[PDB]
Each structure stands twice: as C-alpha cells, then as structure tokens.
C-alpha cells in the first residue's frame, strides 16, 4: 500500500494509455475492445439510474465516456491525492491535463449516435460532480458522512481491486466493501487485469494479486451479484511492453441481487 505513495500519475498514463496500448486505430487493440465492452453494455439500456460512482478512478476518465450519458450525478474517486489532482486538471480543463480526445472520439465512433467528441467530454465534465478520496479496504470506503449520494444506482471500477489487494481474500473483501455503496438491483461494471502480479508506475512498483476469470466470477457471486456478462481480452505479444506482466483483461457486468 505504502508503495502507492511513490505512484506517478503521468508515468502510469504513459505506460497504459499512450501508444502502443493507447493506440485506438487498430480494432483488435485493448483500447478499442475496452470501450466497446462499456458502450455495448450501456446501449442495452438496462444499466440506468441517477447516480454512479467510479471506484479508484486514478487519473483516467475513459471508463465513464459511454456511461456519463446515462447518469446525471457522477462521483469519481481515488485513494491518492495526486490522482484526484490530475483528474481535476482534466475536469477543469486546466493546463497540463491529460489528453483524452482520441478516446472520446472513439467512444463517439463506437456508440454511433452521430455525436461530436466535444459534446461527449462536455457532458462528462458536466455530470461529474465530485472527486472524492476513497479506500476500498475500509468497510465504508468513502467514510462516515460522504458528499456522495448513497446508495448509488450503479458502480464502475477499472483495475482497482486486484491492484490494491495482496491476495484473493483481500480482493474478496474489498469487493464486499464497495458492494455496500450499491443500491439493491443496482449494476456493477468491473474491469481488471487477469493473472497480473506487478506493474510499474514510475518509481512505484505495485504488487498485484493474480486473478483468473473464474476467480473473478466466483468472487462476484460470493458478494451477492448476478453475473450478467463476463468477457476476456488476451493481451497480445506486441502490447507486452515491460511495464507489467498482465496476461489479459476482463470485463464484468454484474447486478447486485
Ligand atoms: N486502498 C485503496 N482504495 C481505493 N483505491 C486505491 C487504494 N489504493 C490504491 N488505490 C488506487 O487505485 C488505482 C489503481 S490503478 C487503476 C486506475 C484507473 N481505475 C484505470 O482504469 O486505469 C490507483 O489510482 C490507486 O491510487
Ligand atoms: O488495458 S491496458 O493495457 N490499457 C488500456 C485500457 C483501456 C483502454 Cl480504453 C485503453 C488502454 C491496462 C490498463 C490499466 C492497467 C493495466 C493495463 C495493467 N496494470 C494495472 C492497470
């Protein structure tokens, strides 16, 4: 955990969201695949409501592009100060913010509702109300009196749990914890690394609990969810850049029953 004190946002974004893993031109890339999972899920029109929380958002916004048009009150979160500060730079359009234009464009492309990418970012920024600190390890992740409207109508978390858990049991608990933030009948979109044990974030060297699709499925169940969908993306050879040892990426659509 203390390892996350040396976690550099810019280095993290450069290792995962800049070429080649960030190139969105090739359909078979992880970028295109990921945005497509989110887009298709929301297009079914079943994941809906008023509020939505992004667990461990880190310095990224992609995971909310297709979502934002379905929830008016979006709450973003993250353990690290530096990460909330990097999100702010992009939300306020301040100088030195990360450039997600390519992602917005592609999300607009995938959705195919003829929307320009500027209207997409404008809507996301508009709907994101707050950027709160969080710790999935605490039984009440956000705290006692959190500004965030609870319980949420849906949850979204990408590459957080398994990246902050030392073993399978912590992973399981952290999932039990965030599930308390979700309203019964609510929806969870969990995205993560498959069979990953480490990944670099600049000077930081984060340890990870390698998990499998089945271990993830079982976990979602043990936490009272009905797995609506679960897909896998096997990391290609040319996307093995040395910044980690991820084997694949998983996408899960679970509904709290
Ligand atoms: N105990 C904890 N509870 C919640 N988030 C935590 C945490 N410890 C670390 N984190 C955060 O979890 C994130 C994992 S990296 C994933 C970032 C982003 N969700 C993406 O899709 O790329 C980091 O931003 C890290 O600061
Ligand atoms: O899928 S990724 O290669 N990049 C990527 C994801 C999604 C899109 Cl839309 C584009 C690119 C990736 C993102 C985060 C993490 C890791 C890998 C492994 N380390 C833990 C964190």
From Swiss-Prot:
Effect of residue 75 to A: Significant decrease in protein expression and enzyme activity with octopamine as substrate
Enzyme Commission (EC) number: 2.1.1.28
Mutation effect (residue 196 to A): Reduced enzyme activity towards phenylethanolamine. Decreases affinity for phenylethanolamine 6-fold. Decreases affinity for S-adenosyl-L-methionine 2-fold
Annotated positions binding octopamine: 196, 244
Activity-regulation annotation: Inhibited by methyl methanethiosulfonate, phenylglyoxal, tetranitromethane and diethyl pyrocarbonate. Inhibited by 4-oxo-1,4-dihydro-quinoline-3,7-dicarboxylic acid, 4-(benzo[d][1,3]dioxol-5-ylamino)-4-oxobutanoic acid and 1,4-diaminonaphthalene-2,6-disulfonic acid.
Recorded consequence of changing residue 12 to F: Strongly increases KM for phenylethanolamine and S-adenosyl-L-methionine
Domain of life: Eukaryota
Pathway: Catecholamine biosynthesis; (R)-adrenaline biosynthesis; (R)-adrenaline from (R)-noradrenaline: step 1/1
One record GO biological process: methylation
Pfam families tied to this protein: NNMT_PNMT_TEMT
Binding site for S-adenosyl-L-methionine: 12, 17, 56-57, 62, 78, 83, 135-136, 158
One annotated Gene Ontology cellular component of this protein: cytosol
PROSITE patterns, alphabetized: NNMT_PNMT_TEMT, SAM_MT_NNMT_PNMT_TEMT
Role noted for this protein: Catalyzes the transmethylation of nonepinephrine (noradrenaline) to form epinephrine (adrenaline), using S-adenosyl-L-methionine as the methyl donor. Other substrates include phenylethanolamine and octopamine. Also methylates normetanephrine.
Protein name, entry field: Phenylethanolamine N-methyltransferase
Organism: Homo sapiens (Human)
Gene: PNMT
